[PDB]
Design a protein around this ligand. Sequence first.
Ligand code: NI
Ligand code: NI
Ligand code: NI
Length: 604
Amino acid sequence: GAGTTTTSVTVHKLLATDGDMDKIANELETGNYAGNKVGVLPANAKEIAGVMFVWTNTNNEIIDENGQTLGVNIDPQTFKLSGAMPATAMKKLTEAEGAKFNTANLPAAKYKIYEIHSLSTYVGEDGATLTGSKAVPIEIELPLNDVVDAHVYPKNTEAKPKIDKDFKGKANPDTPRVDKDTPVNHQVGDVVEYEIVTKIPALANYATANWSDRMTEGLAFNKGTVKVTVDDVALEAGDYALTEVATGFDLKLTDAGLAKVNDQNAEKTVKITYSATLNDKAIVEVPESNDVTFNYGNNPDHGNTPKPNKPNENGDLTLTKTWVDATGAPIPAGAEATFDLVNAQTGKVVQTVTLTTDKNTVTVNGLDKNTEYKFVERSIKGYSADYQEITTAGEIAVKNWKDENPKPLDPTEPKVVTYGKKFVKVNDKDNRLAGAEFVIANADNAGQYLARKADKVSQEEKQLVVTTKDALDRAVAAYNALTAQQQTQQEKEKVDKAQAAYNAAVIAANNAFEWVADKDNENVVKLVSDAQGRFEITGLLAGTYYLEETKQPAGYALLTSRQKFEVTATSYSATGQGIEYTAGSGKDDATKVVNKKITIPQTG
Ligand code: NI
Ligand code: NI
Ligand code: NI
C-alpha cells in the first residue's frame, strides 16, 4: 500500500489532421466532465501509435514505476533530456489504442508525462514527422479524482520538408524543373554553380538534418566554396560540421544548427550553394552529375547519399548489404531490399534488383566498364541507407540502420556535357596520312586560336605535352623515311602508339580554354594525325570552328585555307559524316581533311 486508487493511465496520442489542435480541445472540453475513455473522437483528430511517453515527477525528473527518481531530468521548455534515457524509467510507446501504464504503485502526487520525439517511431503519410504539440507534457495528479482507470489525450501536428537541387538561381522545391535530366553543354574548365534549397516545416523537431552530395569523376568538387544560410542568414562555424572529400561533401547540422530550424513559428528556408569544375576526365557526350540526399528525422539518422562507382574489368558490379540497429550493432536482415541500378552520368534506371532476407549480395554483369553507376535503395520503413565510401571498382556496400525515421528527401539533379569532333587526314585517293599538324581558329580568315589557359596548367602537364610531342616527332620522321611497302601495320602501330600518348597528354593539359592571337604560342592546342590519319578535339562548347594546317604531311603542300567545322551535341558520334574514324568500323563518324600534292607533268 503506497499507490493510489487510480491504478492505470492510458495515453492516447491524437493527431490533428488539419492544423487545429485547439479545435480538438474544444470538443473534449464540451464532451467531458472527468477523464474517462472518450467513446468517439472529433472528426479532426486521429489516434497514432509509435509515440514514446515517459513519466516525470512535478520537478521534471524522470521516475520509475514506484515513483523513484532516476537522476535524469527533462527540460520543461525544450523537452530535452539531461542524460541517456534511464533503463528502468516508466516509459512506453503508444500502440494503436494508446499507451496503458500501470499506475498502481505511484504515491499520491502530481506527475508529468512527456513526449520524447527523439525515441518514437511514428512516421506520417508521405514521410511527415510530428511537429507541434498541445497538452504535452500531460499534467496528471493521482489519484485522478474518482477514476481508477484514466485516459488522457495529448495532441500533435505533423509536417513534411521539401527540397530541390539545381544550378545557381534555378532551384525550386515546390515545382522542380521538368527538363532537368537534359544535359547542358559546357566546356572543360567551366565552373558549375549549384544551389540546394530546403524548406523545413514550422515547429520541426529534428534530431538529424544532414545534406550529402557525391559527384561523378568528371566534376571536381571545389573545396571551400560551401555556404549555408537559414532564411538568408549565414550559419556560424559551430552550427554545422562540414566534411569535404574528393567527390563531394557531407554537411551536418549540430545542436546549435538544429536550434535554428527546429521549434520555429514559420516554414524555414535552408540554402546551400557551392561549385564544381568540369575537368579533363569528362568524356564527350557523356553527362556528368552531382547527386544530393537529405537525411532527416526526429530520431538521429545515419543515412547519406549514394557513391557512384564503375564496374570492374569484366563489366561486373556487386552490391553488398549489412544491417544494424540504432546503436550500430549487427542485426538480422530487416526485410526485402529493392534497389534501382541507375546510370550515374545520365540519371536513368538501368535495372532493378531485389535482395531477399537470406541473400545479402547481388552481382550485375554486362555493364560498361567506363560508366559510373549507383544502387539507389528504395525506402525501407524503419530503415535508413548508409552508402559506404568506395574503395574498389566493382564493389558497392550499403549499411541499413534501424533509425525509424522518414524516407530521405532525394532531389533530381541537372547534368552537364562537353562536345567534340573527329577527323581523318587523307590524300585525294583516301590514303591515310600521318604527321599533319593542325590548330583550331574561331574564323575562316583572321581571328584567334584555341589554347589552354596558362594559369590553369602546371609545369608537369606542359612538359608531358612537349615530351610526347618530341617523341611523336621522331616516330613520324622514321615512318616518313620508309617506303610505301615498308610502312606496314607493325610500323604504323609505332606511330599510332606515340600519337595516342601525345593526344592523351593534350587532353590532360587542356584543363581550361582561352582564345589567343598567336599560333606560335606554347599553349595553343595542336592536333596531329596518326598513321591511320586520325585526330580529334574534345571538351568544347557547341559552335563553328576552323582547322588551320600548320605542317603538312611529308611530300604534300600546305593547305592555303581553313576548313570550317561544326561542333554539336552529336558531332563526335554521329554517322554519315563521310569517313570511318577507324577503317572497317562500319561507322563513318569523322570528316575527311583532304591534303593536296603538286606534281610536275610530262609532254611530247
Ligand atoms: Ni567518366
Ligand atoms: Ni539526388
Ligand atoms: Ni590535367
